Amino acid sequence: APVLENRRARHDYEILETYEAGIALKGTEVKSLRAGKVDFTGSFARFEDGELYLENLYIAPYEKGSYANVDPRRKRKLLLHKHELRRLLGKVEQKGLTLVPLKIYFNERGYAKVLLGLARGK
RNA sequence: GGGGGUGAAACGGUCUCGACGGGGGUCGCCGAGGGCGUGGCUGCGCGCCGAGGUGCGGGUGGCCUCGUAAAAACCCGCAACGGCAUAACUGCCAACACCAACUACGCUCUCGCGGCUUAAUGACCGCGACCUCGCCCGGUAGCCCUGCCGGGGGCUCACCGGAAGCGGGGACACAAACCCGGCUAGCCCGGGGCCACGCCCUCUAACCCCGGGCGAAGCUUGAAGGGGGCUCGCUCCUGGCCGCCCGUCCGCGGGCCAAGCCAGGAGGACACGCGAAACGCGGACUACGCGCGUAGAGGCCCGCCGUAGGGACCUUCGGACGGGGGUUCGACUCCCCCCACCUCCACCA
């Protein structure tokens, strides 16, 4: 059911800032939301790649049958404007202020989007 | 096994606006702290010979080059030893109050009685002793009742002296290196005019004060006034000299005048500008004889739309609905149709 979001973020790790970004899914990953296959623990933004990236996210597909149970962990790029990014990139790197997926959602224009908050231990 | 039914949180949401790259471009948010250089100015650069050296420099211009000249440099040093020698250049052993910052059988000489009572001495803390020693007294020197006087006022542990009054003891732990008391609260040698919009000898206040002296020395009888003195002219100011001269530097030119002086007025005493004041017509830029334009590692500021000569964002695209083509304002669910998927469909039976 669609209100899947990491509910640790008020009793485990605090959040000091929040940003918005997308990630390249596929529909079987989205179609997970109706059942509930998702938590965001162990998943954080990273850099080592030239683009900013997001990895380790257990979306864990559910369609109807078997259709396309792809690995959900995979690296997907984070577009995340230079006005934000060149005021935050070390937070992504140095992990005491990890930009982490709190929730994934579909936005104003059909795109899979991720809410990124400043966590640690996440 | 396919179709219809299903392939976002249904059906109905297909660039991740972006990070990061690149087409059309901005020069901005973000890297780039605005940036970046083709300049300007020295009233053209130079002078009658001059400046100047090859890794980075000391020395050298008497060696020796570049300057319309007639052909191409050196001695020494940075450059010595990582932990180590002299080479690191004659390395280099450490600091507070003993009689007391901190700690005692203590400390300038013999003892005692309780405290202390857990625990040892009854020297500890409170208390009593032939005496150190204070209170304060017998003294050299050096010092603020320094008037006359009552009286060396008296002293300092450097060097010494009693018992005529004790604080308390074998520590009971730094100011008589200047002070108490009365009669005229004074007298004598003597310097010398400040004071009031500058005063004084002078005068109503006899004419002088009283700063200092007397144990270790020197500047003030005056309010109403002037003739004269002081610092000049009692005091000030009138004309003759005062004051003033265009980047380095030059031709044809050169004046009117306080103060201070030579002298004369006016207010009772500086009354403060009574007025009386001041450059023109021109010019080279190594001085006109002479040439090179580098005597040369310049002195001080700006200039340009414009960053090419540091990056990469605005717009926009490499990159997501399990594929792969057409196609709607709205797609994988309109038309397809492979694979999947729930139900229906195609041997035989």
d(CA A12, C1' B319) / Å: 35
d(CA A34, C1' B73) / Å: 92
> Mapping DSSP to helix (H, G, I), strand (E, B) and coil, where does residue A20 land?
strand
What residues contact A21, with CB distance under 8 A and at least 6 apart?
A52, A54, A78, A79, A80, A113, A114, A116
Q: Please name the nucleotide lying closest to A87, CA to C1'.
A: B30
Domains parsed from chain A with CATH numbers: 18-119 (2.40.280.10)
Does strand B come within 7 Å of the CB of A67?
A: yes
* C-alpha to C-alpha distance for A18 and A80, rounded to whole angstroms: 12
Q: Please name the nucleotide lying closest to A70, CA to C1'.
A: B322
* C-alpha to C-alpha distance for A50 and A102, rounded to whole angstroms: 23
Q: Please name the nucleotide lying closest to A51, CA to C1'.
A: B20
Query: How far is C-alpha A3 from the geometric centre of its chain's CA atoms?
Result: 14
* C-alpha to C-alpha distance for A9 and A58, rounded to whole angstroms: 17
What residues contact A19, with CB distance under 8 A and at least 6 apart?
A80, A84, A88, A99, A115, A116, A117
| Strand B bases contacted by the protein (CB, 7 Å) | 6-9, 13-21, 29-31, 313-314, 319-323, 332, 340-342
Angstrom resolution of this structure: 13.0
d(CA A5, C1' B71) / Å: 90
